[PDB]
Amino acid sequence: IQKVILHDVLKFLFVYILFLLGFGVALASLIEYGSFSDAVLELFKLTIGLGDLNIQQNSTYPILFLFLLITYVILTFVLLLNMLIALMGETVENVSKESERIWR
Amino acid sequence: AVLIAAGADVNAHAKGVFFNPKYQHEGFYFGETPLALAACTNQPEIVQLLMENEQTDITSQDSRGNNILHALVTVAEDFKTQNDFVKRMYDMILLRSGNWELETMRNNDGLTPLQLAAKMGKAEILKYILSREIKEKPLRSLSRKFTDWAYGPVSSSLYDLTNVDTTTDNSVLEIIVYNTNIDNRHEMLTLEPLHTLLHTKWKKFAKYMFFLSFCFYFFYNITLTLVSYYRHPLALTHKMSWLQLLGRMFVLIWATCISVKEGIAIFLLRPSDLQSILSDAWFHFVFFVQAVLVILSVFLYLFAYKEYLACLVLAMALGWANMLYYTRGFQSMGMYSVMIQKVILHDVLKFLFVYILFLLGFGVALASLIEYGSFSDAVLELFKLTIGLGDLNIQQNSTYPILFLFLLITYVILTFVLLLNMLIALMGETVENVSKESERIWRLQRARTILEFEKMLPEWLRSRFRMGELCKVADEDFRLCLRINEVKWTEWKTHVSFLNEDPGPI
Amino acid sequence: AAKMGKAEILKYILSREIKEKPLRSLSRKFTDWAYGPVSSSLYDLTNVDTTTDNSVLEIIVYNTNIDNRHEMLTLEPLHTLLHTKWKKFAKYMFFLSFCFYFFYNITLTLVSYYR
Amino acid sequence: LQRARTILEFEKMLPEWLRSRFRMGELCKVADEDFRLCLRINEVKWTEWKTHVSFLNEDPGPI
Ligand SMILES: CCCCCCCC/C=C/CCCCCCCC(=O)O[C@@H](COC(=O)CCCCCCCCCCCCCCC)COP(=O)([O-])OCC[N+](C)(C)C
Ligand SMILES: CCCCCCCC/C=C/CCCCCCCC(=O)O[C@@H](COC(=O)CCCCCCCCCCCCCCC)COP(=O)([O-])OCC[N+](C)(C)C
Ligand SMILES: CCCCCCCC/C=C/CCCCCCCC(=O)O[C@@H](COC(=O)CCCCCCCCCCCCCCC)COP(=O)([O-])OCC[N+](C)(C)C
Ligand SMILES: CCCCCCCC/C=C/CCCCCCCC(=O)O[C@@H](COC(=O)CCCCCCCCCCCCCCC)COP(=O)([O-])OCC[N+](C)(C)C
Ligand SMILES: CCCCCCCC/C=C\CCCCCCCC(=O)O[C@@H](COC(=O)CCCCCCCCCCCCCCC)COP(=O)([O-])OCC[N+](C)(C)C
Ligand SMILES: CCCCCCCC/C=C\CCCCCCCC(=O)O[C@@H](COC(=O)CCCCCCCCCCCCCCC)COP(=O)([O-])OCC[N+](C)(C)C
Ligand SMILES: CCCCCCCC/C=C\CCCCCCCC(=O)O[C@@H](COC(=O)CCCCCCCCCCCCCCC)COP(=O)([O-])OCC[N+](C)(C)C
Ligand SMILES: CCCCCCCC/C=C\CCCCCCCC(=O)O[C@@H](COC(=O)CCCCCCCCCCCCCCC)COP(=O)([O-])OCC[N+](C)(C)C
Ligand SMILES: CCCCOc1ccc(C(=O)CCN2CCCCC2)cc1
Ligand SMILES: CCCCOc1ccc(C(=O)CCN2CCCCC2)cc1
């Protein structure tokens, strides 16, 4: 658990906040807002798994109000999380031969 | 030997088309002399027999301008094919000559044998030339590596930096970095006078110029966000003498200084290739896009054009994507961003083409039990379902109940069990192959950074940040050298070659 | 040897070079010229090309019994004989078959969507 | 193995006047009155140094 938090998880968080505060303030275009508390929260609730689509219905533009919402889902799910699993597999493979001595 | 001692000419020049081919399989370029042919086909006893003759002109030039030492560089290959002999023919011919006439000669491209091995990507001839130590007594000025002192298992050497540093145009360090043709550049930047010459540039000036470039681009995106969030936003055309008026000015000035600077570097750079944009000049375009969109949004507003808010959100949302560029100052975060590139190219672009084939395949063809405006709506009810939310009023208001799952189950089996789980299975294979190369392919990125900070320095400041020391390596031979220390426990010999009897730093 | 899947006897026969003087017509691989480390050879295509019925290239491809077919198609006159067919005619017939089946699904969708 | 079965089915649906134009091979003279239909492949080899006795042409090159 120690080798995964140091070598893998702390680098994931810096890249994700760069998009979460990147997209988050810059969503207040088709709906404006108090954006930094709210439009950041509507992109974090969407990442947990719940979602509220009344803001897409009450948008200035319909289906075009998916391009900043699709580009968020492509990066954070396909790209960033699946590359975390690909690096934890490399990290477990190197520490499994040393974990008996570094425990003792 | 019968023919030569009967009057045969030893200075012929085969000027044919077969000996000067256009393509590799149509002929054999060897150097157009009887001495280049005996050397390039591994016949060392005829090479000695031809140089002991007195009519042999060892300093002649053929149709390309090449001489005997340019010709051996051209036919040189790896260890897996030729195995030794070009490196052993190079110094047999060099030591017999006995001076710097062959090594300092320029062909019709204007290159020496040192610069031609770097232009063509020969990493085994170049390893030989840069660290060439000749320990004999009458021929020691033909060296590029000296020994300053030694005591026990402790030595101190002196490399030579005459054409391998960036004090002259078209040098060995510059050629390797800007060379888009060859593909083993990150195995030629680990060689011994070149590895330490980039490491010293980073600690003296180039890590401080890289922090100042990061602060000013960080403040450019904060100021562009705050004046656009607290609302036309920019340039404040109605003066109320407001303090912190610089924020509307600083965004406008700095967006012109990028667009001019990237207008040049796009115009000069053209290695015309699809591999060029994906590897070197991706960020030369996408800093030029943003600097246009800030300026063009101001020019739209001044007449009536009303599209002055579309560009500003594009200029802000792109302006935060670009700041992953600045991760290459740290080894930890830099190598991580390298593997983002290899995953987007090799894994993600192929996933998207197969998924849209089902998303527009199922999507229009769902309008059967519910009809619809299907292409906007029934496509959206299959993309909302993939995000994670779902709306089941259309299944209740279907023509057929539970049968309205077969096109909805066949969608979930493919996109979750099959397609996504095979993406993870391929990223594990892709990370495993690039993890051994990511340290060198990162250093090829940072080496191009250092050599562009050096060009934007005035001449009084180039002189202060400069490596090298004038040593005395022979009788009136003063060179500009670079000292590297070493500890070696395996070869025990007595020391005869040294520039100083008394060791130590002094 | 191709019907039964013997990839070591078949490697021997297809590239059989006999350099002796009285028995050289028993070869299936000749040397046209050579100069230094550069040569140019000539394979033989008498029963291994598809100009006759029941040939060596046809037998290996349509052979469902054996299981090492993809190790018999990498042998030296057969690897280059398929690569040349693809560049002359077979990559252009494969694009024309893709366009017409693409237009068949677009037209079948639009006439069924706009009822 | 998938693409090789594709090529050999496109070849069957060609008329006989068009088979003749797309055809590999060249009539060589490999012995006394032995004309065969051959396929030329080039090679570069740096490891075996021998002198050449077997060759159909003294004068090399494409011609
Ligand atoms: C805040 C979110 C909640 C998370 C919990 C709070 C976290 C608080 C933690 C704070 C500091 C972390 C613990 C100490 C780390 C020291 C070095 C280390 O071990 O890292 C190693 C891995 O490489 C990395 O982890 C790179 C660090 C990522 C930089 C992003 C900023 C901080 C990340 C934090 C969060 C991102 C959020 C970004 C928001 C601004 C470096 O490799 P090494 O094995 O040490 O090799 C020697 C390197 N050396 C030669 C240079 C010495
Ligand atoms: C001695 C003190 C006085 C010396 C003054 C001499 C004058 C020297 C300078 C002269 C001119 C510099 C050119 C910049 C032009 C304006 C800004 C601009 O538009 O360019 C660019 C920024 O470029 C930078 O701002 C980098 C910082 C360079 C300044 C050097 C600091 C002083 C030199 C002393 C150093 C010693 C320090 C160590 C001391 C121990 C903007 O583009 P970018 O996107 O930000 O760049 C990314 C490139 N990319 C697009 C390819 C991705
Ligand atoms: C114009 C923006 C593109 C958007 C769609 C994509 C279209 C084309 C896509 C093609 C996919 C395959 C090619 C990917 C790029 C080349 C490889 C690469 O460098 O990967 C980089 C991707 O880094 C990023 O993700 C940021 C760059 C912009 C992408 C959009 C991010 C969110 C934008 C928000 C919305 C804005 C919407 C746009 C507004 C108009 C990572 O680079 P690196 O390895 O970490 O650093 C070293 C790189 N080097 C060695 C090359 C120097
Ligand atoms: C649009 C969705 C948003 C995504 C962002 C926008 C993306 C815009 C990007 C556009 C072009 C991509 C960047 C340049 C790639 C050049 C070659 C390359 O590096 O790929 C490599 C990986 O192999 C592949 O990636 C295969 C490509 C998939 C084909 C699907 C169509 C386009 C994919 C895009 C999206 C799918 C959607 C489909 C909708 C129609 C090929 O391997 P290689 O290492 O180069 O080896 C040399 C190969 N060679 C010998 C032939 C030279
Ligand atoms: C662990 C580290 C990361 C933590 C998670 C990040 C999220 C943390 C979540 C909340 C943090 C704050 C808690 C209270 C919530 C808001 C109140 C507030 O003061 O916000 C102020 C800033 O909001 C703005 O001014 C919007 C403009 C963007 C600010 C600059 C861009 C930042 C991007 C670069 C950042 C540099 C670092 C980037 C790192 C790569 C004002 O808010 P407001 O606009 O007036 O509306 C809300 C006010 N209300 C509630 C009263 C209605
Ligand atoms: C230049 C690059 C070429 C591509 C075109 C990209 C441009 C955009 C693409 C399609 C837009 C279609 C029309 C909208 C723009 C017209 C202006 C407008 O009035 O709309 C408004 C919204 O404007 C926006 O902010 C756009 C919506 C999302 C922001 C950008 C993401 C879309 C980029 C997708 C492709 C990226 C590139 C694809 C490859 C990565 C702005 O003005 P407003 O009406 O005052 O504000 C509405 C609120 N109010 C009415 C209540 C006040
Ligand atoms: C978005 C949220 C941002 C929040 C922060 C996120 C952080 C990260 C995210 C992104 C940032 C990633 C890169 C930026 C860091 C700088 C570049 C760098 O490599 O750092 C270097 C130091 O950097 C320094 O120079 C130390 C600072 C003190 C002196 C600098 C003051 C200006 C120059 C003064 C003169 C003024 C001009 C002349 C006037 C007389 C690293 O050095 P190190 O770490 O100590 O050791 C590592 C080993 N290494 C060196 C081989 C790597
Ligand atoms: C990045 C690339 C992929 C992008 C994502 C894909 C989805 C992009 C999402 C939206 C894209 C368009 C945006 C506007 C929304 C619809 C408006 C419109 O003009 O659509 C028209 C086409 O719709 C039809 O005519 C339905 C019949 C199917 C079309 C042909 C099959 C396509 C499959 C093969 C495709 C070849 C390529 C396949 C690649 C492997 C008419 O629409 P409508 O039927 O009248 O109802 C909607 C009209 N309304 C809103 C006014 C009510
Ligand atoms: C201010 C909030 C900072 C929290 O920063 C993170 C938020 C979410 C994540 C996630 O990874 C989302 C979890 N996600 C994982 C995969 C399946 C569904 C849930 C990571 C960092
Ligand atoms: C016009 C829309 C094009 C977007 O094209 C994609 C949509 C979704 C995905 C996904 O991969 C869904 C994300 N999914 C990942 C696993 C857990 C839950 C979220 C990929 C491409």
Residue numbers in the entry:
A (entry chain A): 579 to 610, 622 to 693
B (entry chain B): 232 to 462, 471 to 610, 622 to 756
C (entry chain C): 348 to 462
D (entry chain C): 694 to 756
Paper text:
TRPV3 is a cation-permeable TRP channel predominantly expressed in skin keratinocytes, implicated in cutaneous sensation and associated with numerous skin diseases. TRPV3 is inhibited by the local anesthetic dyclonine, traditionally used for topical applications to relieve pain and itch.
Three-dimensional reconstruction with four-fold rotational symmetry (C4) resulted in a TRPV3Dyc map with overall resolution of 3.16 Å. For each subunit in the TRPV3Dyc homotetramer we built an accurate model of residues 118–756, excluding the regions of S1–S2 (residues 462–470) and S5-P (residues 611–621) loops that were not resolved clearly in the cryo-EM density. The overall architecture of TRPV3Dyc is similar to the previously solved TRPV3 structures. These sites are formed by the transmembrane helices S5 and S6 and have not been previously shown to bind TRPV3 inhibitors. This conformational change does not propagate to the channel gate, which is formed by the S6 helices bundle crossing and maintains a similar conformation as in the closed state.
